[PDB]
Enzyme design. Structure first.
Site, mmCIF file in Angstrom:
data_model
loop_
_atom_site.group_PDB
_atom_site.id
_atom_site.type_symbol
_atom_site.label_atom_id
_atom_site.label_comp_id
_atom_site.label_asym_id
_atom_site.label_seq_id
_atom_site.Cartn_x
_atom_site.Cartn_y
_atom_site.Cartn_z
ATOM 1 N N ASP A 128 0.810 -1.194 0.000
ATOM 2 C CA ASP A 128 0.000 0.000 0.000
ATOM 3 C C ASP A 128 0.856 1.263 0.000
ATOM 4 O OD1 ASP A 128 -1.872 1.950 0.301
ATOM 5 O OD2 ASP A 128 -2.907 1.057 2.013
ATOM 6 N N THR A 129 1.078 1.801 -1.211
ATOM 7 C CA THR A 129 1.876 3.032 -1.297
ATOM 8 C C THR A 129 1.141 4.216 -0.693
ATOM 9 O OG1 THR A 129 0.976 3.532 -3.454
ATOM 10 C CG2 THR A 129 3.049 2.270 -3.401
ATOM 11 N N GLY A 130 -0.148 4.064 -0.371
ATOM 12 C CA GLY A 130 -0.782 5.229 0.272
ATOM 13 C C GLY A 130 -0.840 5.066 1.783
HETATM 14 C C1 LIG Z 1 3.045 5.702 13.810
HETATM 15 C C2 LIG Z 1 2.437 6.840 13.018
HETATM 16 C C3 LIG Z 1 0.931 6.949 13.241
HETATM 17 C C4 LIG Z 1 0.404 8.314 12.824
HETATM 18 C C5 LIG Z 1 -0.934 8.309 12.092
HETATM 19 N N1 LIG Z 1 -0.779 8.163 10.648
HETATM 20 C C6 LIG Z 1 -1.824 7.865 9.872
HETATM 21 O O1 LIG Z 1 -2.932 7.681 10.376
HETATM 22 C C7 LIG Z 1 -1.625 7.775 8.365
HETATM 23 C C8 LIG Z 1 -1.768 9.141 7.716
HETATM 24 N N2 LIG Z 1 -2.560 6.852 7.729
HETATM 25 C C9 LIG Z 1 -2.425 6.410 6.479
HETATM 26 O O2 LIG Z 1 -1.555 6.734 5.671
HETATM 27 C C10 LIG Z 1 -3.432 5.330 6.087
HETATM 28 C C11 LIG Z 1 -2.915 3.940 6.456
HETATM 29 C C12 LIG Z 1 -2.704 3.671 7.943
HETATM 30 C C13 LIG Z 1 -1.290 4.014 8.382
HETATM 31 O O3 LIG Z 1 -0.385 3.865 7.540
HETATM 32 O O4 LIG Z 1 -1.095 4.501 9.500
HETATM 33 N N3 LIG Z 1 -3.691 5.427 4.649
HETATM 34 C C14 LIG Z 1 -4.895 5.149 4.168
HETATM 35 O O5 LIG Z 1 -5.814 4.759 4.883
HETATM 36 C C15 LIG Z 1 -5.070 5.353 2.663
HETATM 37 C C16 LIG Z 1 -5.726 6.723 2.455
HETATM 38 C C17 LIG Z 1 -5.088 7.848 3.259
HETATM 39 C C18 LIG Z 1 -3.857 8.363 2.913
HETATM 40 C C19 LIG Z 1 -3.279 9.385 3.641
HETATM 41 C C20 LIG Z 1 -3.936 9.919 4.742
HETATM 42 C C21 LIG Z 1 -5.172 9.408 5.099
HETATM 43 C C22 LIG Z 1 -5.735 8.381 4.360
HETATM 44 N N4 LIG Z 1 -5.848 4.288 2.051
HETATM 45 C C23 LIG Z 1 -5.520 3.002 2.160
HETATM 46 C C24 LIG Z 1 -6.663 2.008 2.257
HETATM 47 C C25 LIG Z 1 -6.198 0.568 2.498
HETATM 48 C C26 LIG Z 1 -7.365 -0.424 2.639
HETATM 49 C C27 LIG Z 1 -6.877 -1.851 2.466
HETATM 50 C C28 LIG Z 1 -8.066 -0.225 3.970
HETATM 51 N N5 LIG Z 1 -7.495 2.003 1.038
HETATM 52 C C29 LIG Z 1 -8.728 2.507 1.152
HETATM 53 O O6 LIG Z 1 -9.116 2.969 2.227
HETATM 54 C C30 LIG Z 1 -9.616 2.464 -0.076
HETATM 55 N N6 LIG Z 1 -10.689 1.480 0.088
HETATM 56 C C31 LIG Z 1 -10.761 0.405 -0.693
HETATM 57 O O7 LIG Z 1 -9.943 0.166 -1.588
HETATM 58 C C32 LIG Z 1 -11.922 -0.544 -0.407
HETATM 59 N N7 LIG Z 1 -12.645 -0.900 -1.620
HETATM 60 C C33 LIG Z 1 -11.413 -1.816 0.285
HETATM 61 C C34 LIG Z 1 -12.259 -2.239 1.472
HETATM 62 C C35 LIG Z 1 -11.619 -3.352 2.280
HETATM 63 N N8 LIG Z 1 -12.584 -4.013 3.157
HETATM 64 C C36 LIG Z 1 -13.284 -3.408 4.102
HETATM 65 N N9 LIG Z 1 -13.157 -2.111 4.330
HETATM 66 N N10 LIG Z 1 -14.136 -4.110 4.842
HETATM 67 C C37 LIG Z 1 -10.210 3.853 -0.377
HETATM 68 C C38 LIG Z 1 -9.152 4.936 -0.335
HETATM 69 C C39 LIG Z 1 -10.887 3.822 -1.739
HETATM 70 C C40 LIG Z 1 -1.715 9.572 12.459
HETATM 71 N N11 LIG Z 1 -2.288 9.624 13.577
HETATM 72 O O8 LIG Z 1 -1.942 10.376 11.531
#
Ligand SMILES: CCCC[C@H](NC(=O)[C@H](C)NC(=O)[C@H](CCC(=O)O)NC(=O)[C@H](Cc1ccccc1)NC[C@H](CC(C)C)NC(=O)[C@@H](NC(=O)[C@@H](N)CCCNC(N)=[NH2+])C(C)C)C(N)=O
Lengths: 99, 99
Positions: free
Chosen positions: A25-27
């Site tokens: 997951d690059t996002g």
């Molecule tokens: C240790 C550091 C923690 C700090 C913490 N950081 C975060 O929360 C950061 C920004 N989050 C992220 O980057 C999270 C991943 C979690 C993580 O890595 O932590 N990324 C994400 O959630 C990114 C979107 C995003 C990007 C940037 C900011 C916000 C949101 N999407 C990834 C996500 C993965 C999926 C398998 C659940 N994909 C989706 O959400 C996509 N959904 C889909 O593709 C659905 N069809 C799939 C459903 C699966 N089944 C189900 N739900 N029952 C949607 C975008 C169309 C903070 N508090 O901000």
């Protein structure tokens, strides 16, 4: 290897002595693994995604193999619906996006 | 180009003739853009990620440019934390993961 995006880019990982399937997951900034009984100390944190936040346990210096490539880094554990490999570990295995 | 993952893979997109920044997200099935006025017909649907489900507007056959590459496909519009380009359009521009 090269992975196309016709389908979810799922790969086999090894963590905690267990094999699992996980999503590259690059996002995702971070790596999040479905609830599992990882040993040792951790730190409570919250992470956010499209529909809000969830509570996870933050574990440092966790050994993980991703599609046969060794890595070590921070892994979050909690009620994620999918095991997700984020940039923090994708960089260690030299993964790029290409077009 | 080839894009490494030490930083988020953010690119410039053009949608409805407006410039925006968006994240290439291999973990997204679909493409979800923040609330905007967008020419074309839409239908309400639900999408989910980390955190749960949200309500979005689905628009089909939308012309969208991604880092100067052309795609025409489905765009979801709603309260996403960031603009995300998913696999439905990344496949159109020939994006792959490589390591
Ligand atoms: C240790 C550091 C923690 C700090 C913490 N950081 C975060 O929360 C950061 C920004 N989050 C992220 O980057 C999270 C991943 C979690 C993580 O890595 O932590 N990324 C994400 O959630 C990114 C979107 C995003 C990007 C940037 C900011 C916000 C949101 N999407 C990834 C996500 C993965 C999926 C398998 C659940 N994909 C989706 O959400 C996509 N959904 C889909 O593709 C659905 N069809 C799939 C459903 C699966 N089944 C189900 N739900 N029952 C949607 C975008 C169309 C903070 N508090 O901000």
């Amino acid at each position: 290897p090269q992975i196309t995006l016709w389908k979810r880019p799922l790969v086999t990982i090894k963590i905690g002595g267990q094999l699992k399937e996980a999503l590259l997951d690059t996002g995702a900034d971070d790596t999040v693994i479905e609830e599992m009984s990882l040993p040792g100390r951790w730190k409570p944190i919250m992470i956010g995604g499209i529909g809000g936040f969830i509570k996870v346990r933050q574990y440092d210096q966790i050994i993980i193999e991703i599609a046969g490539h060794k890595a070590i880094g921070t892994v979050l554990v909690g009620p994620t619906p999918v095991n997700i490999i984020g940039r923090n570990l994708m960089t260690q295995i030299g993964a790029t996006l290409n077009f």
